[PDB]
Structure 1
Amino acid sequence: SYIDLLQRFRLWNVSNEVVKLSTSRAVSCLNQASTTLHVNCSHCKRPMSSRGWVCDRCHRCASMCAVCHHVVKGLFVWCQGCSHGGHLQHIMKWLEGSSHCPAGCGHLCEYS
């Protein structure tokens, strides 16, 4: 009931906080359901393991921000029409600055 009330007000931080520290098993399971992605390499089209940033057949490090050309080890944003992305903070600043895919391809990732 408390979590429903909290979500009603769009207070997601505290709702997830209650979820994480919830003392019952049935409540500390809502964010463990269908929240994990499966990541692929766009050159080889084969899956990569769960604790790495490189490709087993490709050998190309498939985690490179399209702004700084550095290896992204944490958070990784992803445009769905370009399959391009990078650091969470870099992409926000670039998208505030302009409306083009930073990697370079005729595509407005937000359509302004």
Structure 2
Amino acid sequence: SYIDLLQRFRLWNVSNEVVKLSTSRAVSCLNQASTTLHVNCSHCKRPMSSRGWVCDRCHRCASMCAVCHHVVKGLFVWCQGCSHGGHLQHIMKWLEGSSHCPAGCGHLCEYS
């Protein structure tokens, strides 16, 4: 009931905080249903491991930010259109100033 009210008022942080600290098994497990993503390198088309950033067969840094050209360890934002992305804040700031894929593909990833 409490979670439903919180979601009605659109308070996601408090809802997730309650879920994490819940003392009930079902409520604790409510948050872990299909929230894991599978990523593959676009060059070798092979799936990657869950604790590394280097391609096993390509030996390439597949997670290099499109703006800063550094390896990304943590948060990564990705576009479904042009399959490009990078650091969360870098991409956000770049898209605040223009409307082109910073990798230079031509796709207007956020049309207009």
Deviation at 1:106, TM superposition (A): 1.1
Deviation at 1:75, TM superposition (A): 0.4
Deviation at 1:29, TM superposition (A): 1.0
Deviation at 1:80, TM superposition (A): 0.3
1:59-108: CA deviation from partner (whole Å, max 9, x where unpaired):
11101110000000000000001000000000000000100000001110
Deviation at 1:15, TM superposition (A): 0.1
Normalised by the size of structure 2, how large is the TM-score?
Answer: 0.98
Deviation at 1:111, TM superposition (A): 0.2
Deviation at 1:55, TM superposition (A): 0.2
Q: Counterpart in 2 of 1:82?
A: 82
Please give the secondary structure, in 2, of the residue aligned with 1:46: coil
**Gaps in structure 1 of 5+ consecutive residues:** none
Q: Counterpart in 2 of 1:108?
A: 108
Please give the secondary structure, in 1, of the residue aligned with 2:40: strand
CA distance in 1, matches of 2:9, 2:65: 35
Provide runs of 4+ in structure 1 moved above 2 Å: none
Deviation at 1:27, TM superposition (A): 0.2
CA distance in 2, matches of 1:30, 1:23: 12
CA distance in 2, matches of 1:5, 1:35: 23
Deviation at 1:53, TM superposition (A): 0.2
Normalised by the size of structure 1, how large is the TM-score?
Answer: 0.98
Please give the secondary structure, in 2, of the residue aligned with 1:26: helix
CA distance in 2, matches of 1:105, 1:62: 17
Please give the secondary structure, in 1, of the residue aligned with 2:24: coil
CA distance in 1, matches of 2:40, 2:33: 21
Deviation at 1:31, TM superposition (A): 1.5
Q: Counterpart in 1 of 2:63?
A: 63
Could you say what the CA RMSD is over the residues aligned between the two structures, in angstroms? 0.5
